[PDB]
C-alpha cells in the first residue's frame, strides 16, 4: 500500500512500512528508535552519544551528515531515505537513488513542523497512535515548563561556542523553542536568525546582562573536543547575573545541535530547559 508524501522539497511516493530505511536526520532516527521502527543505514560518523547503538554492525554505515556515501546508499537500494536541512542541497542526488522525504523544522512554527514530521512517520510506518501518545506527553511537558516559566521573569540568552568564538540565537532560530514554545523571556528578541548563529563578542553578553545563559558546545560534537567552559567562563562573562547565580546552563549538544526534532530529543531538550531554571 503505497502513499504520497508532500514536503518542503516536493512530493514522494513511498511504500507503506518500507523494508530498507536510510536516515540522515538524528531527530528522525531517535523518533524511529522511540517507535520500535527498524532502520538499515545511518551516518555513523556523527552519531549522537544517546544513539550510539546505531554503530552496531547490524546497521549499514552511509557516511556522515555532510558526507553521504552515495555509492553505498545505491548498493543498499533503500525503500526510503529521510533527510533534513544539512542535506537539503543533495535532495536530487538522493531522490535519484530512492524515494527521499525531506523533514525539516520550520523554526517559525517549531512544534507544528515537529508534529507533522512525526505524524508523517506515523503514516509511513503504521505508528499513528504511538506518535499521538508521544506528542501528548511532550504537550504536558511543555505546559509544565510553560507554567514554571511564567512563575518568574528574568531574561535569557542562547549562545553557541566553536573554537573560542561565540554566536547567539533568539526567537525563531534553531534554538528558539526556549523562547517561542516554553515561554522564557529573551534578552534580545530581534536576533538575526542564522543556522550557525549571529556572531557576537563577550562585550555583547556582559551588556544585555542575562539571568540565564544557555550554552551549546558545538566543538564537543563537531570536533570531539569540548570547549564550552573556557570560551565562556572568562572575566567579562563572569560579571553577569548568570555566573553569579550559577545559571550558566550547558545544553547537551548531542541532543541540541546534532539531533533535535525527535520524540526523544525534544523531550530531553525541554527537560534540560526545565532543570536549567529550577
Ligand X SMILES: O=C(NCCCCCNC(=O)c1cccc(O)c1O)c1cccc(O)c1O
Residues that bind ligand X (CB under 6 A): 46, 65-66, 85-86, 195, 222
Report, in Å, the least distance between residue 79 CB and ligand X: 26
| In the complex, minimum distance from the CB of residue 256 to ligand X, in angstroms, rounded to a whole number | 11
- Cβ nearer to Ni ion, comparing 79 with 130: 130
The alpha helices in 196-257, defined as continuous H runs, are 202-208, 219-222, 228-232, 235-238, 241-244, 253-256
Distances 152 to 38, 140, 232 between C-alpha atoms, Å: 43, 19, 25
User: Residue 47: which residues within 8 A CB-CB, separation 6 or more?
Assistant: 26, 54, 55
35 binds, among Ni ion, ligand X, none (CB under 5 to 8 A by kind): Ni ion
Q: What is the closest distance, in whole angstroms, from the C-beta atom of residue 15 to ligand X in the complex?
A: 28
Nearer to ligand X, 137 or 195 (CB): 195
Query: Which residue's CB is nearer to ligand X, number 125 or number 257?
Result: 257
Asked if 262 contacts 26 with a C-beta cutoff of 8 angstroms, the reply is yes
The piece of 7-15, 122-130, 203-211, 257-265 that touches Ni ion (CB under 5 A) is 122-130
Look up residue 169 and give its DSSP letter: E
The whole-angstrom separation of Cα 271 and Cα 278 is: 10
The minimum distance between CB 104 and ligand X, in angstroms, equals 9
Number of amino acids touching Ni ion (CB under 5 A):
7
Q: Is 129 in the site for Ni ion (CB under 5 A)?
A: no
Hey, which bits of 99-143 come out as E strands? 100-102
Please state the closest distance from residue 62 (CB atom) to Ni ion, in A.
Answer: 8
Question: Which residue's Cβ lies closest to ligand X?
Answer: 85
Q: Which stretch binds Ni ion (CB under 5 A): 31-39, 108-116, 196-204, 257-265?
A: 31-39
- Sign of the Cα torsion 109, 110, 116, 120 reads positive
User: Is residue 224 a contact point for Ni ion (CB under 5 A)?
Assistant: no
166 φ, ψ to 5°?
-140, 135
The answer to whether 207 contacts Ni ion (rule: CB under 5 A) is no
Nearest 10 degrees: Cα torsion 112, 188, 184, 195: 40
Dist. CA 145–CA 179, nearest whole Å: 12
Using CB under 5 A, which residues numbered 61 to 120 contact Ni ion? 69, 72, 75
Partner whose footprint covers residue 86, from ligand X, Ni ion, none (CB < 5 to 8 Å by kind): ligand X
In the bound complex, what is the minimum distance in angstroms from residue 240's beta carbon to ligand X?
27
Rule CB under 5 A: say whether 130 interacts with Ni ion.
yes
- Among candidate residues 205, 224, 201, 204, the one with its CA nearest the CA of residue 214: 205
The residues that touch Ni ion, with contacts defined as CB under 5 A, are: 35-36, 69, 72, 75, 130, 132
Amino acid at each position: 500500500e503505497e502513499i504520497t508524501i508532500k514536503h518542503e522539497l516536493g512530493e514522494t511516493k513511498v511504500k507503506k512500512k518500507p523494508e530498507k530505511v536510510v536516515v540522515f536526520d538524528f531527530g528522525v532516527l531517535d523518533s524511529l528508535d522511540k517507535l520500535g521502527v527498524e532502520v538499515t543505514g545511518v551516518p555513523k560518523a556523527n552519531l549522537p552519544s544517546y544513539l550510539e547503538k546505531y554503530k552496531d554492525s547490524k546497521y549499514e554505515n552511509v557516511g556522515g551528515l555532510m558526507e553521504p556515501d552515495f555509492e553505498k546508499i545505491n548498493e543498499i537500494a533503500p525503500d526510503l531515505i529521510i533527510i533534513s536541512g544539512r542535506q537539503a542541497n543533495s535532495y536530487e542526488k538522493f531522490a535519484e537513488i530512492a524515494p527521499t522525504v525531506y523533514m525539516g523544522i520550520d523554526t517559525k512554527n517549531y512544534i507544528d513542523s515537529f508534529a507533522n514530521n512525526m505524524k508523517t512517520l506515523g503514516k509511513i510506518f503504521g505508528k499513528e497512535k504511538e506518535v499521538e501518545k508521544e506528542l501528548e506527553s511532550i504537550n504536558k511537558q511543555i505546559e509544565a515548563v510553560k507554567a514554571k516559566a511564567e512563575k518568574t521573569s528574568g531574561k535569557a540568552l542562547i549562545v553557541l561556542t566553536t573554537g573560542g568564538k561565540v554566536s547567539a540565537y533568539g526567537p525563531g532560530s534553531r534554538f528558539g523553542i526556549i523562547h517561542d514554545v516554553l515561554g522564557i523571556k529573551p534578552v534580545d528578541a530581534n536576533i538575526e536568525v542564522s543556522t550557525h548563529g549571529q556572531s557576537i563578542s563577550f562585550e555583547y553578553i556582559a551588556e544585555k546582562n542575562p539571568d540565564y545563559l544557555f550554552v551549546v558546545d558545538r566543538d564537543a560534537v563537531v570536533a570531539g573536543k569540548p570547549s564550552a567552559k573556557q570560551t565562556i567562563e572568562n572575566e567579562l562573562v563572569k560579571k553577569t547575573n548568570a555566573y553569579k547565580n550559577n545559571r550558566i546552563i550547558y545544553l547537551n549538544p548531542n541532543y541540541w545541535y546534532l539531533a533535535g526534532g525527535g520524540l526523544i530529543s525534544v523531550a530531553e531538550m525541554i527537560n534540560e530547559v526545565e532543570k536549567g531554571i529550577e
